[PDB]
Nucleic acid binder design. Structure first.
Ligand code: K
Ligand code: MG
Ligand code: MG
Ligand code: MG
Ligand code: MG
Ligand code: MG
Ligand code: MG
Ligand code: MG
Ligand code: MG
Ligand code: MG
Ligand code: MG
Ligand code: MG
Ligand code: MG
Ligand code: MG
Ligand code: MG
Ligand code: MG
Ligand code: MG
Ligand code: MG
Ligand code: MG
Ligand code: MG
Ligand code: MG
Ligand code: MG
Ligand code: MG
Ligand code: MG
Ligand code: MG
Ligand code: MG
Ligand code: MG
Ligand code: MG
Ligand code: MG
Ligand code: MG
Ligand code: MG
Lengths: 93, 132, 208
RNA sequence: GAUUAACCCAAGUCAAUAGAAGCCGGCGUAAAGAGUGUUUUAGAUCACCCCCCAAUAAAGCUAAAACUCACCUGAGUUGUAAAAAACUCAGUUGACACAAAAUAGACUACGAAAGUGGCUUUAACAUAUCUGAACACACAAUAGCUAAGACCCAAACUGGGAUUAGAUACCCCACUAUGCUUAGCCCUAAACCUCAACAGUUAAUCAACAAAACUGCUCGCCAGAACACUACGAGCCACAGCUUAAAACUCAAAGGACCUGGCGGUGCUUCAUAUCCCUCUAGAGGAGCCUGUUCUGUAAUCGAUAAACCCCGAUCAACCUCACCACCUCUUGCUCAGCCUAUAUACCGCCAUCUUCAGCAAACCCUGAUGAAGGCUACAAAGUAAGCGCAAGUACCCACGUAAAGACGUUAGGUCAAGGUGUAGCCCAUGAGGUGGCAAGAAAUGGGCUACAUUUUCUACCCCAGAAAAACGAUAGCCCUUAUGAAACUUAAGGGUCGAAGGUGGAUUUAGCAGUAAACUGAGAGUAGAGUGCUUAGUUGAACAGGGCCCUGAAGCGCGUACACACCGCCCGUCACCCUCCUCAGAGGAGACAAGUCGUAACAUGGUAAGUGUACUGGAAAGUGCACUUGGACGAACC
């Protein structure tokens, strides 16, 4: 299932943590998490939000961050690491 | 809303004349033309010259008879004679009326190179067609 | 409408105006006396007392019209009628005397019967109960039925499937098919009826 | 702030602080009648005058419907707005509870209150005077804890299925604590009829609303809001609890009831007449082109920019127009200067807008206790109204229709660049003049023209024809000529050259009710020339016009309202943003200040009605379960 989230570049840390926990729940549930981030802010600054969100789950980018909405927003897709990918993570760990 | 030469209604304490009481669309239906000349007919010439002359005449008479005109002037043109029929208020002295009539007639005759007559009609106070 | 409400539509029937005065009921005599003192519109340029006048064909020509080209539309209609009659005459002559009894050659009759066959009995109308519209089957008035028949015929003719085929031939062929209860128009009517029957379960959604 | 003047007191004035004025007022909604009942001490004069229905405890019983089990029959059952999930259990008949008690009840009784509505029986419903507990005793729905049983059904939490941006909810399924019985605890409710007990009156009423106003007596309670159903102290079988309950910091309000307006994912009724939906016709949304705009670019205007902008100011830009940019030049300057410099949120002027409306109304009168406010009923009940608008009248071809007209106001709606104009600003320049130059397309989007053809295309003709038909299809591009002009690759027309995209177009959307839509043909405005634009004359000339109310809306009558900058409103909570105070070993709590982050919990039926108590759960408001309240409604003859 596709679970979608919409965020702002000026989202507070408490809201960000809450939505991070929600995304973790979805990933554990094995859902595709489509995250969109909208706006001054740089697109790299926005993509840092994706870095942090996936940092909290050392989940993987099924689709990498991409500019959308006329380039105003970024969008990405996260997925639960397959069994083989998780085994690779364990080995590298 | 249309504002063209319309006297907007008020508390009923605003006197107005027959000319002012009627919006533009009534022209030729309830009120005639304040200037009569052939310039605007089919195929005639010098419409602009006639109009400029009319405008200057109106401004000139207004400034020459300050606070004396009661209603708008009536310009008429017959051949080359120009006739300004005006309605004024019985306040200024008749001596000054006669002086200004002579002066206006002479100056306008010389300025527009055509005989000019001024026909004054004196009234006690501005005719109040209605109160708006 | 330049005509004031007082004006009434003219009636064009020589038989009606020549009906004997004795045959008139009280109400009919009253109607005539009232019309004696009523305002009547001018006779429209589309109809006349011509014995050959056909209102159905007049309406069909009007529906076929494109951009006020009454001349072209009427020309197409007469060409269609002539083509139908010629086809029927050819079939009649080429056919045996036994089946010549059934072979019909009146183009007007063929046209009327084809339209009547194509008329769809039950339509699908949107009906809204509780805020949601559904395509409920519903009876149709005769006016709507005739109009739908004519419109389906004309649209089928206008389709681009028949390329480089003149409208007279297209319409004559389709009219003959409909008369013999075949062809895309009859297929469409049956499809509408089939959809209505499939949606029969929603009939109660109607309130009128 | 300075200055001028004025005012008050005056050898004083008045900044700060302190004090002086503190109870016979109230308790339905503003704080206040404490959840209920009974004393002693006392108080009062209201003391002598003067059967039954649904209380409660115990014991017993069961009609309907469940569950389970038996039969046999079937492959489906449950689930809703639609589904998924869930079970192979489903139907008939029969047997069968420690669960809950249709109809009666349209009754209004019992009890002190909580509560009590299946049946029978036993016991039983205190006081011949009324008040009387934070000062004790006995009770106190639902929830909840303790220990043991029952468990049909329902059900917090939990799990699953949906829905969702998310869904810790609303919807569906399963199941647990729990609801039940026993013995203890707990002692809280919007425990509200928010209206204390007793006795009495209906007379001169009475802020508002609500359930009319009061008198006497008594007890309890109240004294701005919030901090605060809080901290501390105290008591308690209570251990995240209950009762009592402050203070500090902070504010000038908080609050109760109404009137008007707006608003309602507000109710009923009736409508929309090219109109909101279906229905008819023709279109746009798909291709090219013309053109406007937004963006990009440039040294290179400005204004409109939701309806009500977008072939708009312009009935028009090669120079000019021109207000733009670059450079150069002039300074009492065409002007008793000048400024297209800012302010349409100072204006006049002319307008859009509802308005495809019909109301606006001065001056009076009355009603409300003489409050904001309101003013209708025709078998008429407080309205009368001058004037404005509609209407009438008028142009066009009728008395039809189209025009015109369309008030008060709404959007601080447009225009300081038509012109003027207040204020502010420039004056060796933000003024004036001269030369040159920009005005393009990455690309999106609006309107129109051309087409996609066979009802077509070319030719003749203006309607009895002949050919074409993969060709149809540019007004696009390139080359040439011509018209105007001083200047033409860039403006227009004609010709040649090329025959391009395209094959009737998605959701969505425009216009039209008849000589209209549609198609076609002219003319005019403005220019030297210039539009597929604009105005307008004319030809041919249609189909539907019948149903409805989801949405748009309109009206009427109502309902609610925490909104009044009027829902684009208000407002809650978390998180982090700084100070004051309090509790605290540092951390919490409150308040204030104050812009954010995530939602939209509350105010409208606030989109799941709101809330009280209690329990579990959750970023967060909050969700759900049980009972209780209306401080919600159910549209108030029958339908
Ligand atoms: K199109
Ligand atoms: Mg107008
Ligand atoms: Mg209160
Ligand atoms: Mg007592
Ligand atoms: Mg007590
Ligand atoms: Mg209890
Ligand atoms: Mg249980
Ligand atoms: Mg109660
Ligand atoms: Mg409490
Ligand atoms: Mg406490
Ligand atoms: Mg304590
Ligand atoms: Mg329409
Ligand atoms: Mg397009
Ligand atoms: Mg502009
Ligand atoms: Mg602008
Ligand atoms: Mg120049
Ligand atoms: Mg220029
Ligand atoms: Mg300038
Ligand atoms: Mg304005
Ligand atoms: Mg009128
Ligand atoms: Mg008009
Ligand atoms: Mg404005
Ligand atoms: Mg503006
Ligand atoms: Mg300048
Ligand atoms: Mg060409
Ligand atoms: Mg030349
Ligand atoms: Mg060709
Ligand atoms: Mg809500
Ligand atoms: Mg709600
Ligand atoms: Mg609740
Ligand atoms: Mg829950």
């Amino acid at each position: 299932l596709r679970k979608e989230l919409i965020l702002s570049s000026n989202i507070g840390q408490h809201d960000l943590d809450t939505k991070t926990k929600q995304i973790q729940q979805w990933i554990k549930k094995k859902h595709l998490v489509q995250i969109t981030i909208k706006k001054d802010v740089s697109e790299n600054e926005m993509e840092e939000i994706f870095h942090q969100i996936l940092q909290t789950m050392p989940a993987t980018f099924s689709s990498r961050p991409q500019a959308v909405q006329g380039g105003k927003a970024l969008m990405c897709v996260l997925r639960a690491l397959s069994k083989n990918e998780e085994k690779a993570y364990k080995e590298t760990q | 809303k249309n504002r063209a030469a319309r006297v907007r209604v008020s508390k009923g304490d605003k006197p107005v004349t027959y000319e002012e009481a009627h919006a533009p669309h009534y022209i030729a239906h309830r009120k005639g033309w304040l200037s009569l000349h052939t310039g605007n007919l089919d195929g005639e010439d010098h419409a602009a010259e006639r109009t400029v002359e009319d405008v200057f005449l109106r401004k000139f008479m207004w400034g020459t008879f300050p606070g004396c005109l009661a209603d708008q002037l009536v310009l008429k043109r017959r051949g080359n004679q120009l006739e300004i029929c005006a309605v004024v208020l019985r306040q200024l002295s008749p001596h000054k009326y006669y002086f200004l009539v002579g002066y206006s007639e002479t100056l306008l005759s010389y300025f527009y190179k055509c005989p000019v007559r001024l026909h004054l009609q004196t009234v006690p106070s501005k005719v109040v067609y209605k109160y708006l | 409408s330049r005509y004031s409400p007082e004006f009434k539509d003219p009636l064009i029937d020589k038989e009606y105006y020549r009906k004997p005065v004795e045959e008139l009921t009280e109400e009919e005599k009253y109607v005539r006396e009232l019309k004696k003192t009523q305002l009547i519109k001018a006779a429209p340029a589309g109809k006349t007392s011509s014995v050959f006048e056909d209102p159905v064909i007049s309406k069909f020509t009007n529906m076929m019209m494109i951009g006020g080209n009454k001349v072209l539309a009427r020309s197409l209609m007469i060409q269609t009628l002539e083509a139908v009659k010629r086809k029927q005459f050819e079939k009649y002559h080429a056919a045996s005397a036994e089946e010549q009894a059934t072979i019909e050659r009146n183009p007007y009759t063929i046209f009327h019967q084809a339209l009547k066959n194509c008329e769809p009995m039950i339509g699908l109308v949107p009906i809204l109960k509780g805020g949601r519209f559904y395509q409920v089957p519903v009876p149709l008035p005769d006016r709507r039925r005739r109009f739908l028949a004519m419109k389906w015929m004309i649209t089928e003719c206008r389709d681009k499937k028949h390329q480089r085929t003149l409208m007279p031939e297209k319409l004559s062929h389709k009219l003959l098919e409909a008369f013999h209860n075949q062809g895309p128009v009859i297929k469409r009517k049956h499809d509408l009826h089939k959809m209505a029957e499939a949606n029969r379960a929603l009939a109660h959604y109607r309130w009128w």
